[model samples]
Target chain A: APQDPRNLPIRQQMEALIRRKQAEITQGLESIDTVKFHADTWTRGNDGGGGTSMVIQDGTTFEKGGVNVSVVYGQLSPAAVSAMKADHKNLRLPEDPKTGLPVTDGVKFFACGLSMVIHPVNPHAPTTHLNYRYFETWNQDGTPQTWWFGGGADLTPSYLYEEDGQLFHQLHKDALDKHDTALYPRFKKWCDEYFYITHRKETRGIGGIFFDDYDERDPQEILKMVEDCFDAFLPSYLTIVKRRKDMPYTKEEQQWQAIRRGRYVEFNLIYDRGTQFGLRTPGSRVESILMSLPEHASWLYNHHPAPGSREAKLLEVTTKPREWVK
Target chain B: APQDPRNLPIRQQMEALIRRKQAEITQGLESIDTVKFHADTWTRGNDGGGGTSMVIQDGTTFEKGGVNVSVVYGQLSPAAVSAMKADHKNLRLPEDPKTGLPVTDGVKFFACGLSMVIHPVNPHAPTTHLNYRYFETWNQDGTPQTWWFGGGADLTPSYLYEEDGQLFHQLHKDALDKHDTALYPRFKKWCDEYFYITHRKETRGIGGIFFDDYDERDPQEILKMVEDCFDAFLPSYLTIVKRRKDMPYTKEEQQWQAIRRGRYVEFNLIYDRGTQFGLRTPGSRVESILMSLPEHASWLYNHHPAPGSREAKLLEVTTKPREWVK
Candidate 1:
């Protein structure tokens, strides 16, 4: 009664990809850490779909991490459709032919994504985040009318490490470069702009690759690109964590890390598009949306690292972007 | 020669009131603590104006506090006028005689306020916030076109203490009752509504009194009411803090306090009108605007306090508003 995954439709294929990748990524993290992640499966009533959130907390290697996969389908409110119109230009809504206006009947939409945020125990081991998703809307006849893909990966470090930044960027650049040489440069800049904290006038972290609304390319080719991008995460990030997880850090360094985590909190709660969108949606699971937050964070009045210190070096990197792979 | 305080205009009178109160508050807080507040006075660089931010951190009784007073006057952008129009309907702009549209020329504006947030070291001692401000816009001849007053005080606790809640509310209620008995109930409901966290389905803390666009009443009576409200903060809050400041707390209780502080951060960043408005304004002092954040806060994935516990009791109070005074 099982069909070969290769014969499945794009929707089912993407769902399968996320499931396999989520398993692989969680296991990869567990192999390096002393503890295992606790998985919680939740469903939206009336078959709206659900998600599996695998979380690890207070571990020897990781302070906190959450890897989540969700597939949800529901009727989109007119307000939601209007909001989406600002971002996804190709999105179309059914209209009343007589009035030449959008129909009162709502449109059905399907969305699936895998998101992960990891905070390592050691201050030297940087925090990182990754997310990828596919979204499609249906016509009145139940035929798919619009579809797109989006995702990105980025790193936030408490201390500047040139080699670590290079390793992370190079892997992602290689993944996208294999498909289109120009893709890496464009998406890297997008990542820097997307993760920015405007009020603080700084990027959330060193840049990475980010892209959205990728229906222009062949769907098959784009799937390959998404796969490769997901593939790059474990080797690039786990290797860095293994190297730095046991590195000794002073109390001051730990305090600096907490302060940086506060910045991370600010970006997510105030500026992160995914978080804002998720929180606004009715019946959305808040715990999953907010799982990106670290277990602890700190803020001090007008905190500034001493000039010429390593903390300042990291702050400098965030304030001024650098081309890592180059 | 300095002018007599009683002979000053309304604008100068509010400025003087805030400065005198700031000094009185800092001195009062220092009376019970081992550390003193460090005052930092900053300017807007173009004779526009500035503020004094008095801060205390890592003290014996208090963890962190910031009491700030700012008097600023400058040209108001059309955008700023539009935003203020939504809240203060009485605001009027100069119009061209022929077109009947607002003139391209900007309007001059003045605003003065005192805001304070105090976080005591002990979990048993609740956090308190108080703010009072006056805003005015001027005509071409420098005559005031419209003005309004706004402010409130509220309390947040990690544990339930009915007496503390009652004291905070009763003081604020009595202050309002002295001017107009109707003001207390109306503003109490407004405070409960204003400080609500929509996503969490809860109020920020025990309700106090909040009012804005308060120009219908006679100016002198309103000013007296404002003075009474400002005078109520020290006795109501400091008494509660002194009673709980020396009470022994467990590490778990301390962690709970940090979690509650996280909620405070969320309310200020995501929902507080003043914080949102200030952060969006150009040339605004970022440090002074964000001084309300505590030294540390925390988050845990899907954390829920155990049923029938003290933490749960506090959560219930936030979720369901209590009639503390009645």
Candidate 2:
């Protein structure tokens, strides 16, 4: 008999959602690529939990990419609790009223997410990234204390294409607006700010939608909204990649792609909090954390594209971002 | 008439040394390659100082490299003062005795250094880096208050050769041993710790001599030691590069080189204190700071060298460093 997802706890529900989405995403990617993804399952023994990492390399479409889903549970250290408290105002941890320190014991966490990054082979085709997660903490009696949903999807292109950027933004906007009119604009700006590369003074991509600590609304409503956003990804991104993947590109254009990939590397290794934290943590899987890096990247000495060229045009928007869909 | 370097102030003397070294280093590299370096001189007006950046690319022997010399001077902000104080205990600053805060005026500093990183075209030819610098802080009356010298040279190879590592270490060891017997052992250990990639649990390369905050000795003695180490770089590194520059390598070997270069990028972008601070500082020359990066690098999913292979042999030494000279 099939398990009743509605009857399951929110943690189990979130795990199921990510596992299903991972399958859908990997299948969708394979539909376009001659090479298929290889799935690897990894686990932490003694209640540390595990995850599945699906990867594709040297494909007709994708150069290299990973779609990973993890469902992990563990005791919350005082440090982890404080870090979360800084981000989540509603988070409550047991404290000794006299000394004002966390009780530490009887606090546990459950986290599940689907994170992905796809780099295409063609310079004309754009790279895409998406992540959605649910996090919750439990009390001594195993009742939920605090919970939140976080994640977003974004697009990065080597060359400027107004229509492609517009399409990518419009679908995400439509999906968010279905729930609330104000959601799209706020989340879109958040995506640009979060993915920004400080040294380069540019957003990692044009923009998409990013939100975190999103527990103000009802969990059921937010879950529906997240599913809608996930559904929107395949149509908008797959459409854009399919159109551009077979398009002919010059060697000069390929070189430009390599340079942009280097910037992507800089952004992840230096600025991305998840990547930095994951790499530093003991017992973390190093390969899965670094899967966001592309297969090849280049760094040229003080490289600048000439004025009036397509490369320079992309820089203009990236340096000073604008509304893609109004 | 040419100025007598001995008659000059220490600041001017250090500037002369670096300028002379930049020429010798670049000329030695050009001697082995079909192409020559292009020099770019940049200045910061109104006491901001400047540097000369020399770069070579697409040479028959070398892929890309930079030989740069900078003589910079400016007011030290309270933050920069405190940061330097952490490293150099001999440093003195004008401070409000009552409040224990740095005074806002009459404190300035001068620094000059020669920095170089060369990535050769052939995988058999190891990459090498060398840097030496002098720093001095001045008082209200323009008298030098405290000063120190810092730098070292190290080699990174995709394939391990026992003799090559021994030769590189022996030269630097001999250079430092001329000053003190204890210097080589201590600085050799320092280099291993300084260039380590903590997450990967490996040193960046084979060990060399590294030292900073060396005001314990007479200034003239330290200067002579620095010059000796600088002199050792040519015979030790250039000879090794020349021996392997034309050695034939297969595509697999080239791929391994690309992977190792990726680790080099990680060390610079994440762990290297100079690079991290340089990238964060305002008005920094971004090009010169990033010039250490190779022209190309690669990151493949879960890349590992097979057991008992040459690549694995290199990993053995990097993971658990050995006394090369001994």
Candidate 3:
């Protein structure tokens, strides 16, 4: 059976998918009275195209938030990727297993993704990041050389509210459960373990279902699953924020939130795998990529909250995870 | 004749040396207009004592500056040194030609030094760092295990002022010329090459002189050399500042100064050998160790100056050095 006319060209398909996802995210936020969303698109002077960066700032519920969509493609020179990867030594790239030669001949690459992060104004509303990307390497003849889809969504919270965490996880679980009932628990555990800051011995956020390089499934099935996940973002997130936004927090609690935000900055700067991968990619947009960071953070000298304080309680939960949404 | 200092316990001599150097650096800044230097001294609750961290903020000429001195003895476990060496991979610690083992045993190690950095308010006046230290490894029974002296002075300028660079380099040259003319050029070149940011393909600042593990020379003679070097710091630095401090600079120039400061931050964070070594040392005071950083810097997107501008000129010269002082 022949593929549909809509799927004839890969570039067209990617652009269409990206535009649709951007609308879905924006439309979801449109109903919120407190949020103001701004969309910015920048063109690459040297290349054919650019990206649309949508930022939502100073919402009643969310403090600063963004959902950015970038679809950029350019000729990938062997030299460029090598140079970029040199800066990031940890990425696992394809190599000739026998001779260890980097496979870089006649490679043209395309990347399109939706990357979103929400930092809630309320201490109770947990921070979350959702990213889903499709990457492809093509031959000179327009045939696919190598192609893979990579990205996952995760949640980070200043304070652990178990129902909120559970809801966040279960929404993704439900989305994946439609495809594979086993997918939720497997990816949920992966998300929890993957986002850990080893030095601080804490996870960046509460766990959400996360998977990457998910190309083993039928292409259309995988695409449908990704759309389901994207569709799931708003309902799960809004339910939590709507509940917590009006909740009162003391000044001390806000200060603790800022301190926890500092840890988020540390993870992104020092150890986040997505950040490292993005920075290593050629023609990567630095501003669009690093939009995940909070505006401010402080490093206090030997700050340890008194035992049994709320601040210490937050640390204890982060260091030792509890069943949030069993 | 048995050495008079040999009769004095090594700890007492080292402690006195630390105190003397601390006093010297502290007193030197006392008369500086508008710059009130605050000194902080604290004992390591886990070990013996160390002293003197002097910080001067918002001076007429200098912005923020710190002069720190410490004398502490501690055992270096093999694991610790291994970790330290990982951070300082380029230190080229020598192995005994016969035993294939490191020539020195891990034991009680004492280090005493005067380390200071003066960051001038005006970018035209260069930021200068000077460090001179004595290191000794002692046996369990209190006899010397192995002894060596290490440290040097280096300069980092936000702006390129060639004559100022020449004067700075020449002062160190003259100081070393009194000892050995060959020493200045050798160590000066070493300084220029050592403090480079390999990723940016630029030197951190203009060069001065640096030498470490200088056990080839007579101990007292080298100690005298170190004193001469410290003595040269004030005259050499003040001469340049007095010339350049009040020199008019445009707002654009100041903005450029901040951007260049971004490079300084990158070098310190990513490549500075001393910073790496200090951070890796057990019970290291991270704040004191990182006190060398400027207050603010920006990491912009693909920032590059047009070819043949003064900015480009600075980058070219720094990337490929020529003799600043003969």
Candidate 4:
């Protein structure tokens, strides 16, 4: 039977949540977009569940962006099994005769996530990203056995606008604070640690809240929490874009953006597990997976900003950290 | 006592040969240069060793190119020893008291190589790369005991010209054949294997020649052969570059070149063992190590050319290999 997300399973409910969030975020971005987000409805081959990828390019407000929703379920391989174990522990799989390794024999799983990355056209407007996910595993009888949720929002800017950074981080902090006073600092630190570009020894962006393996609270309560956080994305991000999008940038500033984007590529390809997982997954759309990459980026031969330049100031802030609470 | 290459030693002789090759290739290239190669001298910290990097950028003929020569000696750690075991199986090191693993006690070792890559401004002029190196391990008695030679030359083209490919292969084949009538086929096959981009399922370009752990002949004979292959670079590549440099290409063709160069970046960073070694080696200059990357490159999402177009023809030749002979 063809599965419908509006029906009753918790997996279906998670899928519905992702779809709803995708629409809401898309509408929020579209409001300021001189160019409408182009919608790509993709289907996984052989009945694998797929999703909608809403993308924007060369807009007055954004350079490139993607707000994507995916609800995928299939038989998990041992590779995916162990990876899932890092977040969800209860995976029961069939075995093989030789090698004596735990081989996954057609065990099933379902995952849904609303993921978005916005790269604004102007260097003054910081690039931002948000992702939230829910995953479920089942026994042979199609009974759900284990579940978890994970996601975060972050800001990357070529030129750091302190006020904008404060606004962005404070909104996310406030949203998480309503959940738990301790949550903001913990998740903020996690974001800083996770987004680090190790070879360069710099974080990909200023920190935000990131957590996985949810179930600290009730699953129903976590869903409500996810909704609250997703709600914060539009307000925190779009207002900053509106404030800064029209600020004039010199060619050097634009070039600096390209240089920063090069670091972004390194982080995504060399280290981002999400991108690595998406590439390995059988029926995933590749373009959508890589939509996080800037429309254009550059790597100069040993480039460094001049002392006291605005570019140098941004690098100083990135290599170090500062408090930003509006 | 500190060491000097000018003092009579076999390692010194190899260093002289690398300098000779560097000068030879640089002059061979300068013969056609509308812009001359600029030389930069670099030193490792604490007088570890140093090298000269000669580069040309935005020339009338070439877009970007580098010819670098380095001679460095250091104690090899257990991590480096195991990596050497994968190719050079004759590493002898002292064992630690705590762990059974082999460890260095500040014992001396030496390596020297002349490496170069050229990216032409014209799409029709194929990009070419060459690298050749010698490695040696000395006995506690300060005498050279074990040594090997490794390196190769390969072509990467945005547009495939059958004659250009044939000429490149034939020259390199002749160079290798002069050493051992049997070597051309073996090294040609090795080049095809070594330069492969597994994820893209394409050869970096049509293969030329590659060989490693080469102690098959007398060491002197091997040195002569390295000289022969290094000598092949100017003749094999420049004639093609000269012929194609004046050819006009549209914006689309130029964009295609950047995409091909993106594959070049992927090959160097992800799969190239030489690059991995350089990056991991303490005190290595990153810019000098990564000089092989083109000045500009790009990745377009899931891009494909029109059916039966020139772009498709180039890709077809890449996915399906062909024999090019004298």
Best by DockQ: 1
Give the alpha carbon lDDT tens digit for every residue of B1-326 in model 1: 11222323777878888899999999999998999999999876566688899999999998999999988777765544543423644655455546544433556777788989999889999998998888777766656577778888888888868998889899988888888789888988888888888777887678788887777676666778888999888899889898899888999999999988888888888778777656665667888988888889988888899999999888888888878897
Worst 10 residues of 4 chain B by lDDT: B1-10
Question: Where does model 1 exceed 4 Å of error?
Answer: A1-8, A77-106, A138-145, B1-8, B45-47, B75-108, B138-145
TM-score of each: 0.91, 0.88, 0.63, 0.86
Count of clashes, each model: 0, 0, 1, 0
Q: Please give, for residues B247-295, the per-residue lDDT of candidate 3 as tens digits.
A: 7878766656666666665566556655655555566565566567654
**CAPRI verdict (incorrect, acceptable, medium, high) for model 2:** medium
Clashing pairs in 3: A156-A205
Docking class of 4: acceptable
Ranking by lDDT: 1, 2, 4, 3
DockQ computed for model 2 against the true two-chain complex using alpha carbons: 0.69
Report the number of the highest-TM-score candidate.
1
Interface RMSD of each: 0.9, 0.8, 4.7, 2.2
lDDT of 2: 0.81
lDDT of 4 by residue, B1-326 (tens): 12633323656666788889888887888777788888988876655676899988878888888899987777654434543423644656564546543445444666788889899888888899998888766666676556778888988889989888898888888888887889988898888888887667788798888887777877778888888888788887778888888888999998899888877876786678777667666677877887887877776655798999988888887787777985
Runs in model 2 lying further than 4 Å from the true structure:
A1-8, A44-46, A75-109, A137-146, B1-8, B44-46, B75-110, B136-147
Model 3 segments beyond 4 Å from truth? A1-15, A26-50, A55-66, A72-109, A118-127, A137-145, A207-209, A239-255, A281-283, B1-326
How far does residue B325 in candidate 2 sit from its true spot (Å)? Answer: 0.5
Better of 2 and 3 by TM-score: 2
Which run of 10 residues does model 2 chain A get worst, by summed lDDT? A1-10
Give the per-residue lDDT of model 2 (tens digit) for A152-176.
8999999878888999999999988
What TM-score does chain B of candidate 1 reach?
Answer: 0.90
**DockQ ranking of the models:** 1, 2, 4, 3
